[PDB]
Motif scaffolding. Sequence first.
Motif, PDB file in Angstrom:
ATOM      1  N   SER A  11      34.180  41.511  36.305  1.00 49.61           N
ATOM      2  CA  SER A  11      33.634  41.781  37.866  1.00 49.61           C
ATOM      3  C   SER A  11      34.927  40.558  39.116  1.00 49.61           C
ATOM      4  CB  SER A  11      32.538  40.600  38.271  1.00 49.61           C
ATOM      5  OG  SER A  11      32.446  39.060  37.258  1.00 49.61           O
ATOM      6  N   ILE A  12      35.660  39.540  38.782  1.00 54.92           N
ATOM      7  CA  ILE A  12      35.960  38.257  39.322  1.00 54.92           C
ATOM      8  C   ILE A  12      37.489  39.174  38.611  1.00 54.92           C
ATOM      9  CG2 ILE A  12      36.749  36.526  39.294  1.00 54.92           C
ATOM     10  CD1 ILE A  12      34.593  35.208  38.679  1.00 54.92           C
ATOM     11  N   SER A  62      42.018  44.983  41.202  1.00 53.25           N
ATOM     12  CA  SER A  62      41.806  46.363  41.622  1.00 53.25           C
ATOM     13  C   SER A  62      42.215  45.973  42.969  1.00 53.25           C
ATOM     14  CB  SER A  62      40.610  46.538  41.675  1.00 53.25           C
ATOM     15  OG  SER A  62      39.702  47.040  40.162  1.00 53.25           O
ATOM     16  N   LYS A  63      41.734  45.037  43.794  1.00 48.94           N
ATOM     17  CA  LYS A  63      42.295  44.805  44.801  1.00 48.94           C
ATOM     18  C   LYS A  63      43.538  44.935  45.151  1.00 48.94           C
ATOM     19  CE  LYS A  63      39.097  43.160  47.831  1.00 48.94           C
ATOM     20  NZ  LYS A  63      39.471  41.905  49.121  1.00 48.94           N
TER      21      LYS A  63
END
Length: 14
Positions: A5-6, A12-13
């Motif tokens: 998630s983190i 990804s970002k």
Amino acid sequence: MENTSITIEFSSKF
């Protein structure tokens, strides 16, 4: 952080 998630939100970002 051994999560999906983190570590993915950043990997990804950016």
